[PDB]
Write a protein that binds this ligand. Structure first.
Ligand code: G09
Length: 212
């Protein structure tokens, strides 16, 4: 093949690497294989990979208003001063309470708000968009969140409040530092990490009680 719909050899594309981060590259081949197609990408760092349609993204931000809770996307994370692209799911479309940003649940647990300009859309997502999440606890969470929506039990926390927050199987004295839309910044008080957590997460002691 040389076309699959709007996918046409030589164009620019994002591809997913074995490290789970995505990188710009050029689509250099399209080959029917099996019931589907596979998509050969030559990355800018000279490398190459043969990716299924759900592991390439288009080099252009989605028209908001085509995006929705469930939408499969790729988004920027800001590792200190590094910047990585990581695949995720849209948990909130923009509105007043979240200061008109998108809440992205990443494939790997984490959550953060972003903007139309920090989002790339995945080319051929599964129908049930979460079925390609490799981590199971996240595949099930996202399934239940998207299906239930607009039901979203969260706890309300105020800046200053003290709570227990789970971390590697143990519950840590911690403190709430800041709240932003559907996320809170917890400070674990023994070892001094901060962490953003979705306020409906069960790592939060209140939410863990509410939910048993
Ligand atoms: C404050 C944020 C830290 N953080 C994070 N970060 C992760 C970082 C993840 C990542 C990013 C870049 C990577 O590639 C580097 C590289 C790897 C191998 C070879 C070569 C290069 C690899 C992994 C991406 N997801 C989005 C967030 N996840 C969670 C979850 C609960 N809590 C937190 C938290 O606190």
């Amino acid at each position: 093949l040389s076309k699959d719909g709007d996918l046409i050899v030589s164009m620019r594309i994002l591809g997913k690497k074995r490290t789970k981060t995505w990188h710009k590259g050029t689509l250099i081949a399209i080959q029917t294989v099996g019931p589907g197609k596979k998509y050969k990408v030559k990355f800018d760092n000279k490398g190459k990979s043969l990716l299924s349609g759900n592991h390439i993204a288009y080099d252009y931000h989605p028209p908001a208003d085509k995006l929705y809770v469930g939408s499969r996307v790729v988004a920027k994370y800001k590792d200190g001063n590094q910047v990585w692209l990581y695949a995720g799911i849209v948990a909130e479309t923009p509105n007043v309470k979240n200061k008109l940003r998108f809440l992205i649940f990443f494939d790997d647990g984490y959550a953060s708000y972003v903007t139309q300009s920090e989002l790339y859309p995945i080319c051929r997502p599964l129908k049930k968009t979460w079925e390609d999440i490799e981590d199971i606890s996240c595949r099930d969470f996202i399934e239940e969140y998207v299906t239930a929506y607009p039901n979203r039990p969260m706890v309300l926390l105020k800046s200053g409040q003290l709570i227990k927050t789970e971390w590697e199987g143990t519950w840590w004295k911690s403190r709430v530092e800041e709240v932003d839309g559907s996320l809170v910044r917890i400070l674990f008080l023994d070892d001094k990490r901060c962490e953003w957590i979705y306020r409906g997460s069960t790592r939060l002691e209140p939410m863990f009680s509410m939910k048993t």
